[PDB]
């Protein structure tokens, strides 16, 4: 039949892709980097302990100022922290308790969050009389909000457990673009620095590269055995790192269109919750379900450092734009700044 | 999912994914490494910055 | 030792508590005394759309109670002009075609029964139900209603709630005391049955039956029956709180007065008839009608007392030989013979006769043998004196007909047939009900000692007390009336001036902002969590229940602590120092105890906590970021 033919043609097409990828595997990243000096053991201490949330922290995000940062907890609040002094700038009681993701706008004027409400709630910080209030509630997803990132103050991109991502026009609250393709809950996304592209990681154990403007998927990276919980771009935007329930992080190059590296160890069985690169991209930081964040040599895949402080799962992490510090958020209701 | 439209949409997608230009892994990796070496001097977590520069140690 | 209303914050809990039983509808609250009282206060003061609708409702309710056709003619034309015609003239009439036509027709014919405005009442209630009910619910009158309703549902009476005075009755099983309920200051009769005596004599079913019976009857405000407001018990005393009747009984006064005249007995008969009627409407046969079980109040009016040997025939008929000998009907005495209201008419005849001749019809020459007293009942017509009136005769003749086929009050229309007796030609039965007829015997000054009838090696066990489990009770109508008629006004006033001070204090303080508004809070209000048990440390905090957590806070601060729904393994009911608490079991094996201020709070906190924790956990289970995994 016609339907059988397209099942077949899609199978031959999947091989043609694998083969084309094998055709480029002339060397490995590990061979290439086999020469250069290892990084040495990274020795970060806890500078700040950010105390305030009354329950599990589910997510965080740094301001572009490398100082202010927003956080979303099970206690149904968002806190915008001055990391330098530990002073809370704002504490924001949310209209839903089931928050999972938060984001800080590039300008530092708006912030966003959402979760099982199925809504991306945008919050203007500099209101006309000192207060904070919801400027917009972006509604359209038929599943929970897994993640969300501003393009600018007028545009934002969301991922959802309805297996889609979306681009919104904040002024009008419209759903400009939908990024259908994933076959499972989308769990995380990362914007390319150009912000013409972004990637998504999902419970179908695949990552995807999407063109923002064109609104379609360019490339699909598979490899992980389990759900992909986190994802971050390499600083040059030619590659990205993923972290999964499979206890491994992985590095995918876009132009080679395949996996370059796997970051793992036999003493790590538990899953990765979050990933972030250091400013140069040489270090890959990963937060784990065993309460530690591990610091990885992105080029040699040796475990370099281990951030051990938190008493429960590290649910989220982030490196500053000036690259001075690492924030880590946790189920123990604390955020810590490492340096 | 006996959707003929849905099947067509997958196939044509797998073309978009298949028919691209790929570079060799060795070229890809070399470019990555060349980046990390270029910006290694601009990464505080990679290199020792004095307390004077660091806005966290002694304030 | 007055009633103290809970804080307005009680609404969050109560509103849900009532919401769960469908008890928040116009119908349900409007047909409650305190509810109605508050609903009109809203409509008549704090609203203008409804003010006229309720005034009209009331003026009619007053019109129903007018004592004459002469009064009705006048007030009808007044009410019609004032409330119906004025609005009609303008054109803005808010009532149906037929409703207005129904009334105006009867007015052009000067025939004004106290019901002509019944079609308006229903259409007033149409106009009030819903749209306006909504605004009332949203108003703090409903809050005030939730405050009283909380007190109502948190009643657990004891002896200490009563100022108990002298003894005014003595029965085989117990005693009756005059008492005042300190609470409101209401005068009552307290009936104390010794459990040890009940066990001894095996009269448990009897004690239990009276309670069950009293409850079928103690609604509707009946002047001619001793009715219950509360029942409760101590470990060894069943206590009934009852209508006060401190003027002895007829069996006594009869012995002090001697026999009564036809006119004197007529009075008693009328009142008893009506009290019979009441029971017979509610499908209850008294089955023990006697001068000893008819009491007198301070003024001389009578009530039927002691419903131990009464019975409900609604579902199935009784057939047992039960009652006092000399007053049992043929159909009763005969075993394997079913019956209903029937018996009490026969019993009536027997007692009324006693009033006139001083002995039972079937008890001449003071013979004690009760077997042959019964023989005179089945196939033997009664012989009557040469000095009875012809009307008294035909009454007693009809009342004591052996055949129920041909007995007075057993032909269909029941009590009406008896009232229609030419013995009562002179009576206006409405005027009997209003207790306007002067009583023939007024009880004396020095206490009567006038309600008497004619060893222990005994313990009380688990299985004895379990008989008295459903015993305690409170009749809502009774308590609301008692409250409405004593303190309801003065308490609301004191409460209002208290709540308004705390609000006006908090305006200056700046504490006045509710943490619960604008979020997804399920429920909130005070509880007390246990700190260190050895220090009697109990800590009243204000709690906020959210779908995924339970927060709480102290005096003038945000919530600093909480407890996630994920943590909670169970919500159990528990006891500490004779206080009901909730016991939450927490993942770490940790315990969390909470005392509530009232039963409905405990009931609702348990339900809603249980609901939340189960739902949240089922939900998180389906959410990769939140669910727990293999660590
Ligand atoms: O004020 C009162 N309210 C009920 C009542 C009942 C009452 O006695 C009822 C019985 C009438 N016939 C003789 C025995 C009386 C009685 C029956 C049971 C009892 F426990 C105490 C007294 C006396 C006074 C009052």
PDB file of N, CA and C in Angstrom, chain A residues 13 136 184 237:
ATOM      1  N   UNK A  13      15.543   5.727   4.609  1.00  0.00           N
ATOM      2  CA  UNK A  13      16.029   7.083   4.869  1.00  0.00           C
ATOM      3  C   UNK A  13      16.813   7.164   6.171  1.00  0.00           C
ATOM      4  N   UNK A 136       1.570  38.990  31.394  1.00  0.00           N
ATOM      5  CA  UNK A 136       0.951  38.106  30.417  1.00  0.00           C
ATOM      6  C   UNK A 136       0.979  36.647  30.883  1.00  0.00           C
ATOM      7  N   UNK A 184       7.841  12.409  22.631  1.00  0.00           N
ATOM      8  CA  UNK A 184       7.706  12.298  24.083  1.00  0.00           C
ATOM      9  C   UNK A 184       7.824  13.654  24.741  1.00  0.00           C
ATOM     10  N   UNK A 237      28.119  27.658  19.601  1.00  0.00           N
ATOM     11  CA  UNK A 237      26.876  27.273  18.967  1.00  0.00           C
ATOM     12  C   UNK A 237      27.004  26.303  17.813  1.00  0.00           C
TER      13      UNK A 237
END
